[PDB]
Design a protein around this ligand. Structure first.
Ligand SMILES: Cc1ccc2occ(CC(=O)O)c2c1
Ligand SMILES: Cc1ccc2occ(CC(=O)O)c2c1
Lengths: 141, 141
């Protein structure tokens, strides 16, 4: 299971942020999209699956199950879409608050937040970042 | 040196594709941008540096040295910009030709091309993909 992810959205300044979490690591990827349309979700799944091993994507609701291009991205890349599973979305938003006045565009602040989340140590000291854990779980596999 | 990348652009259907190569692995990331502006290059560097260890980015010309937001992205993420160093751009374009009629948007075909490039074996058989090599070099570090 180095290939299990959770996909959810969150909202900030009235724009949509897609969030993929690697469950076993807490590594995250995220992007501001211009609406919820299946167009962009599909594109971000394909991007994510070109980068990392993506085998199963868990979602919490039915929106991803009613989109033709997500179905086609899933199929082209060999991703199982699968129903049933947060505050990862809440801690993301704290860091977006700590950095928001360091960049003009919200989407720059989302990427600064992802950077910090991925590279920091739990507690601030010792052990691995999310970034190290995802590589260590895939390497160890 | 798990953190050395090459950054270049290539062109197709009159749109710009940014290309980051992890030199020791051949792993690639790429994105269609709406012009060459330092805005998008900076954003893609920040994205790339949130995902992987990015310490030094080599470029071949002076365009990245004259952009304020690239300078600011470099500085915020701790990336050394460094002058002096392809046909990686040419093999990318072969695969974009093999897949172009499977997606409406060129940018979907660029991501299908990156997927294949990153996950395939050299020869088609045995050894590691680019995706496995980048994780193996970072893990082994
Ligand atoms: C098959 C596939 C996979 C991912 C995608 O992202 C966006 C699209 C739409 C398009 O350009 O054809 C798309 C298609
Ligand atoms: C400091 C920094 C780093 C990466 C970036 O990408 C785009 C911008 C512009 C902006 O929104 O402030 C930007 C800034």
């Amino acid at each position: 299971s180095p290939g299990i992810w959770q996909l959810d959205c969150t909202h900030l300044e009235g724009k949509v942020i897609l969030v993929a979490v690697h469950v076993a690591s807490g590594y995250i990827e995220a992007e501001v999209i211009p609406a919820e349309t299946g167009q962009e979700t599909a594109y971000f799944l394909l991007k994510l699956a070109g980068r990392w091993p993506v085998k199963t994507v868990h979602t919490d609701n039915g929106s991803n199950f009613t989109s033709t291009t997500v179905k086609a991205a899933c199929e082209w890349a060999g991703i199982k879409q699968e129903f049933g599973i947060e505050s990862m979305n809440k801690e993301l938003k704290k860091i977006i608050g700590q950095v928001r006045d360091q960049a003009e565009h919200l989407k720059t602040a989302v990427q600064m937040a992802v950077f910090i989340h991925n590279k920091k140590r739990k507690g601030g000291i010792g052990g691995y970042s999310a970034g190290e854990r995802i590589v260590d779980i895939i390497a160890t596999d």
